[PDB]
Design an enzyme around this catalytic site. Structure first.
Site, PDB file in Angstrom:
ATOM      1  N   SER A 158     -25.778   5.177 -16.395  1.00  0.00           N
ATOM      2  CA  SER A 158     -25.471   4.322 -15.291  1.00  0.00           C
ATOM      3  C   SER A 158     -26.636   3.873 -14.548  1.00  0.00           C
ATOM      4  O   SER A 158     -27.811   4.653 -14.375  1.00  0.00           O
ATOM      5  CB  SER A 158     -24.218   4.726 -14.673  1.00  0.00           C
ATOM      6  OG  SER A 158     -24.304   4.059 -13.339  1.00  0.00           O
ATOM      7  N   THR A 170       2.633   2.129  -2.362  1.00  0.00           N
ATOM      8  CA  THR A 170       3.931   1.955  -2.976  1.00  0.00           C
ATOM      9  C   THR A 170       3.909   2.070  -4.447  1.00  0.00           C
ATOM     10  O   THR A 170       5.040   2.063  -4.852  1.00  0.00           O
ATOM     11  CB  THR A 170       4.382   0.299  -2.653  1.00  0.00           C
ATOM     12  OG1 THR A 170       3.234  -0.444  -3.140  1.00  0.00           O
ATOM     13  CG2 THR A 170       4.619  -0.087  -1.238  1.00  0.00           C
ATOM     14  N   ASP A 171       2.829   1.868  -5.287  1.00  0.00           N
ATOM     15  CA  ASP A 171       2.696   1.981  -6.753  1.00  0.00           C
ATOM     16  C   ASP A 171       3.375   3.126  -7.027  1.00  0.00           C
ATOM     17  O   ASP A 171       4.253   3.175  -8.090  1.00  0.00           O
ATOM     18  CB  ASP A 171       1.341   1.591  -7.104  1.00  0.00           C
ATOM     19  CG  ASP A 171       0.286   2.771  -6.876  1.00  0.00           C
ATOM     20  OD1 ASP A 171       0.398   3.567  -5.998  1.00  0.00           O
ATOM     21  OD2 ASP A 171      -0.981   2.495  -7.498  1.00  0.00           O
ATOM     22  N   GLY A 179     -13.435   2.222  -1.525  1.00  0.00           N
ATOM     23  CA  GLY A 179     -11.977   1.801  -1.915  1.00  0.00           C
ATOM     24  C   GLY A 179     -11.786   0.333  -2.416  1.00  0.00           C
ATOM     25  O   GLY A 179     -10.690  -0.152  -2.165  1.00  0.00           O
ATOM     26  N   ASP A 215      -4.643  -0.028  -9.392  1.00  0.00           N
ATOM     27  CA  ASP A 215      -5.948  -0.517  -9.479  1.00  0.00           C
ATOM     28  C   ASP A 215      -6.326  -0.962 -11.045  1.00  0.00           C
ATOM     29  O   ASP A 215      -7.038  -2.054 -11.014  1.00  0.00           O
ATOM     30  CB  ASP A 215      -6.972   0.520  -9.185  1.00  0.00           C
ATOM     31  CG  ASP A 215      -6.845   1.368  -7.928  1.00  0.00           C
ATOM     32  OD1 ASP A 215      -6.335   0.751  -6.926  1.00  0.00           O
ATOM     33  OD2 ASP A 215      -7.530   2.537  -7.929  1.00  0.00           O
ATOM     34  N   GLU A 262       0.750  -1.173   0.080  1.00  0.00           N
ATOM     35  CA  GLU A 262       0.075  -0.045  -0.075  1.00  0.00           C
ATOM     36  C   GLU A 262       0.946   1.361  -0.089  1.00  0.00           C
ATOM     37  O   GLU A 262       1.544   1.465   0.752  1.00  0.00           O
ATOM     38  CB  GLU A 262      -1.009  -0.041   1.126  1.00  0.00           C
ATOM     39  CG  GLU A 262      -2.348   0.467   0.789  1.00  0.00           C
ATOM     40  CD  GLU A 262      -3.074  -0.468  -0.051  1.00  0.00           C
ATOM     41  OE1 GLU A 262      -3.096  -0.363  -1.170  1.00  0.00           O
ATOM     42  OE2 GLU A 262      -3.665  -1.399   0.461  1.00  0.00           O
TER      43      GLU A 262
HETATM   44  N1  LIG Z   1     -21.591   2.481 -11.668  1.00  0.00           N
HETATM   45  C1  LIG Z   1     -20.877   3.744 -11.792  1.00  0.00           C
HETATM   46  N2  LIG Z   1     -21.943   4.577 -12.147  1.00  0.00           N
HETATM   47  C2  LIG Z   1     -21.621   5.791 -12.322  1.00  0.00           C
HETATM   48  N3  LIG Z   1     -20.346   6.413 -12.015  1.00  0.00           N
HETATM   49  C3  LIG Z   1     -19.522   5.882 -11.396  1.00  0.00           C
HETATM   50  C4  LIG Z   1     -19.862   4.019 -11.150  1.00  0.00           C
HETATM   51  N4  LIG Z   1     -18.850   3.521 -10.694  1.00  0.00           N
HETATM   52  C5  LIG Z   1     -17.662   4.498 -10.114  1.00  0.00           C
HETATM   53  N5  LIG Z   1     -18.364   5.826 -10.875  1.00  0.00           N
HETATM   54  C6  LIG Z   1     -17.535   7.026 -10.602  1.00  0.00           C
HETATM   55  O1  LIG Z   1     -16.387   6.773 -10.050  1.00  0.00           O
HETATM   56  C7  LIG Z   1     -16.360   7.431  -8.618  1.00  0.00           C
HETATM   57  C8  LIG Z   1     -16.017   6.552  -7.742  1.00  0.00           C
HETATM   58  O2  LIG Z   1     -14.539   6.505  -7.795  1.00  0.00           O
HETATM   59  P1  LIG Z   1     -13.615   6.651  -6.605  1.00  0.00           P
HETATM   60  O3  LIG Z   1     -13.833   8.014  -6.098  1.00  0.00           O
HETATM   61  O4  LIG Z   1     -12.312   6.655  -7.152  1.00  0.00           O
HETATM   62  O5  LIG Z   1     -13.939   5.431  -5.552  1.00  0.00           O
HETATM   63  P2  LIG Z   1     -13.638   4.048  -5.757  1.00  0.00           P
HETATM   64  O6  LIG Z   1     -12.759   3.861  -6.801  1.00  0.00           O
HETATM   65  O7  LIG Z   1     -13.011   3.739  -4.346  1.00  0.00           O
HETATM   66  O8  LIG Z   1     -14.720   3.078  -5.939  1.00  0.00           O
HETATM   67  C9  LIG Z   1     -17.937   7.760  -8.553  1.00  0.00           C
HETATM   68  O9  LIG Z   1     -18.294   8.901  -7.400  1.00  0.00           O
HETATM   69  C10 LIG Z   1     -18.335   8.009  -9.831  1.00  0.00           C
HETATM   70  O10 LIG Z   1     -17.959   9.399 -10.263  1.00  0.00           O
HETATM   71 MG   LIG Z   2     -10.743   4.807  -7.344  1.00  0.00          MG
END
Ligand SMILES: Nc1ncnc2c1ncn2[C@@H]1O[C@H](COP(=O)(O)OP(=O)(O)O)[C@@H](O)[C@H]1O
Ligand SMILES: [Mg+2]
Ligand SMILES: [Cl-]
Ligand SMILES: [Cl-]
Length: 414
Positions: free
Chosen positions: A80, A48-49, A138, A191, A46
């Site tokens: 979505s 580390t990337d 996360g 990721d 963690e």
């Molecule tokens: N199924 C989805 N539909 C719409 N937006 C999405 C979806 N999955 C991810 N997102 C977008 O990506 C964001 C989440 O990414 P992030 O903040 O990096 O959190 P994580 O990667 O931990 O899930 C959401 O707030 C939205 O903007």
């Molecule tokens: Mg993310």
């Protein structure tokens, strides 16, 4: 009270059926196909990337499904299942960095990034997304979205990168560029490498040194939980969402400048190779101007070495030693990196007191999820213990996900 919730992954059939229906309900036309990319958990390695270090993620069975059709124009329409009545529309012609508002920045920025890379065949598209990767937990909903979009565009535009591990690195870099430069979210690459290069039954030992070719920078490490009668418990804390991540990178970049190294991997490898690793670390930290920077460097150095220790422990079936390494990775993130919050720390403490071989926060921190190596059959019990403690603390109810090392992104239907 309700028992703790487990979020089941969408089956192939469910994800295809649901993505296709949202596409037809939205756009009328049938999609050209459906692709998908998984969420992930980082087992260890963690922060580390972006230090050119080592990481060890698995792909979750939870996937984002994209139904897509290319357009002959430069229009991008996305929808979505999170908000199925709200179609986002942008145009790729003259689109600049940060030129897209909201979630649609993630998919639209992938086509933008491919055109920026010289892929002039890439025009617009329509897409519909359905996911069981929770947003902002996360678990990398962001990579599942960008990587599914990259694999779909590569396929429909016939770019020839999706059918090989090495070729997927081109698609990964487009996914990273979308998120960094279109969405404006700093990402280090763990990721997206997980989402497009993990394999079923394995963890991805990823070497983040930027000079390595694709066949040099991954090795598939057997991660067969059933072999050892184990379960990997994953608990989304649902802690209230939170430039602290910018500050951690900045501190690491300044540490590397002061040391006179390109990256802290160079530092960590020199300490690792010393006969007296304690003295090699002391001499490094002595070079650093302030106590907080020393803490940050101590985390990255010890954490890179814990990745190799983990890979060895798991191959030896030494689950107690593997758990201790999870534990040490967490404790380092809590005390030296300072990226934990009470929900993470208390979830981990309940897991440790209730028989976990080890437990840790996963991902960037500041909330999100924990993982714990537990005996097979104990994941529900430990999850319920965390949910009972969360309510005593006044915290939001957590939720759990079944987890094992699953397949990377793929075409699901055509
Ligand atoms: N199924 C989805 N539909 C719409 N937006 C999405 C979806 N999955 C991810 N997102 C977008 O990506 C964001 C989440 O990414 P992030 O903040 O990096 O959190 P994580 O990667 O931990 O899930 C959401 O707030 C939205 O903007
Ligand atoms: Mg993310
Ligand atoms: Cl154009
Ligand atoms: Cl910092």
């Amino acid at each position: 009270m309700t028992a703790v919730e487990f979020i089941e992954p969408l089956t192939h059939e469910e994800g295809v059926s649901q993505a296709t229906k949202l596409f037809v309900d939205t756009y009328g036309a049938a999609p050209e196909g459906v692709w998908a990319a998984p969420g992930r958990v980082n087992l260890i390695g963690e922060h580390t990337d972006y230090n050119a270090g080592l990481c060890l993620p698995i792909a979750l069975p939870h996937r984002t499904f994209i139904a897509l059709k290319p357009r002959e124009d430069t229009k991008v329409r996305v929808v979505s299942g999170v908000a199925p009545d709200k179609v986002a529309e942008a145009d790729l012609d003259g689109l600049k960095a940060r030129g897209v508002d909201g979630w649609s920045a993630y998919p639209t920025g992938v086509a933008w990034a491919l055109r920026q890379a010289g892929f002039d065949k890439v025009k617009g598209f329509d897409a519909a997304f359905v996911s069981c990767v929770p947003l902002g937990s996360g678990l990398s909903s962001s990579a599942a979205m960008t990587c599914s979009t990259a694999l779909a565009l590569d396929d429909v535009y016939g770019l020839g990168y999706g059918d090989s591990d090495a070729g997927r690195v081109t698609l990964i870099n487009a996914a990273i560029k979308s998120e960094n430069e279109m969405a404006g979210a700093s990402t280090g690459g763990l990721d997206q490498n997980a989402s497009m290069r993990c394999t079923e039954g394995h963890a991805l030992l990823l070497d983040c040194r930027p000079e390595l070719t694709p066949l040099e920078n991954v090795s598939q490490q057997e991660f067969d939980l059933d072999k050892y009668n184990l379960e990997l418990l994953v608990v989304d804390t649902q802690a209230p969402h939170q430039g602290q991540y910018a500050q951690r990178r900045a501190t690491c970049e300044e540490a590397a400048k002061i040391l006179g190294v390109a990256n802290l991997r160079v530092t960590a490898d020199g300490i690792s190779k010393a006969d007296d690793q304690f003295q090699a670390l002391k001499e490094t930290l002595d070079a650093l101007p302030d106590e907080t920077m020393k803490k940050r460097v101590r985390h990255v150095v010890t954490e890179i070495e814990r990745v190799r220790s983990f890979v060895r422990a798991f191959a030896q079936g030494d689950i107690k030693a593997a758990g201790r390494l999870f534990n040490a990775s967490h404790d380092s993130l809590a005390a030296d990196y300072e990226v934990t919050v009470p929900e993470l720390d208390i979830a981990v403490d309940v897991a440790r007191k209730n028989g976990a071989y080890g437990a840790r926060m996963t991902g960037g921190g500041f909330g999100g999820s924990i993982i714990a190596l537990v005996d097979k059959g104990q994941g529900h019990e430990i999850a319920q213990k965390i949910a009972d403690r969360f309510e005593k603390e006044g915290f939001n109810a957590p939720r759990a996900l079944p987890a094992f090392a699953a397949a990377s992104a793929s075409r699901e239907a055509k």
